[PDB]
Amino acid sequence: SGRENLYFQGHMDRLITLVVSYSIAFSIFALATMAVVYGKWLYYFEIDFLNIPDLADMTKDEIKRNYDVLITYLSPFYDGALHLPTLDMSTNGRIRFVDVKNILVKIQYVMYATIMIAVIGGIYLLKKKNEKFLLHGSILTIIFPIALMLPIAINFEKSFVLFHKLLFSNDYWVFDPEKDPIILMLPEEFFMHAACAILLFILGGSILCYSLYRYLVKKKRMSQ
Ligand SMILES: CCCCCCCC/C=C\CCCCCCCC(=O)OC[C@H](O)CO
């Protein structure tokens, strides 16, 4: 009965490596996203770099406290509404930031799931002297954030319509600086730089996981 019982098991660890490697890819993507979204140093740098005080007709102290309040609001543990210290906000502006908050709690929710599956299924594979999930995952974390960008290559303007309508509850509403002046201290350059910082953290994440794959496999070879 052994023949038929390892044809099954070999295809099992092959699948488990797949689920674990994809779980590591998303876990690193979500961790990097959370580090940049809730990190303050990048935006604090953009204040002087992009001259946000003159962009928004605000002082630096006002920009930072309004930003600090926004990031506190986007945490999944703050149940209160968004109250900017010195800025007005329209009904559609509050709707937009609840949309932004909702994807973050969605990403974190799935992140906690993938982290557990990656570490639980990962030690099951390490107990079996199998390390390729640290290698398969390593390349998969580089490939995950970019597979989300693939629709851009088919149609640039059109597939940004798809992202916008999957995330946001108001199709047609745009930020009016008179009614939602926080838009003037969130320039487009900050969001692109933030996306680059996410991939930077993702790239660094795959390196350490690849380094772990090679640390494990060299010890495994120096044993046999
Ligand atoms: C040695 C094996 C490691 C096992 C032990 C560590 C396992 C956790 C793994 C990564 C850290 C993830 C921590 C959870 C990140 C919280 C998500 C988050 O930061 O959101 C909260 C808030 O919005 C922002 O301040």
Ligand SMILES: CCCCCCCC/C=C\CCCCCCCC(=O)OC[C@H](O)CO
């Ligand atoms: C997209 C790449 C990921 C970037 C990582 C995020 C880092 C930003 C930090 C906190 C969120 C700030 C609140 C988000 C503000 C959204 C404003 C908006 O809705 O877009 C502008 C609108 O299209 C014009 O009218």
Ligand SMILES: CCCCCCCC/C=C\CCCCCCCC(=O)OC[C@H](O)CO
């Ligand atoms: C290498 C790229 C890595 C991909 C990383 C993508 C992560 C997206 C997931 C959550 C973002 C949550 C915050 C959503 C903020 C979007 C607001 C926005 O994009 O508006 C900017 C606009 O272009 C000017 O105003």
Ligand SMILES: CCCCCCCC/C=C\CCCCCCCC(=O)OC[C@H](O)CO
């Ligand atoms: C079992 C597989 C082990 C694989 C080993 C690779 C682990 C990758 C760890 C970090 C890279 C992601 C970069 C994210 C930078 C730190 C993320 C973080 O934990 O901070 C969250 C933030 O502080 C919330 O407020």
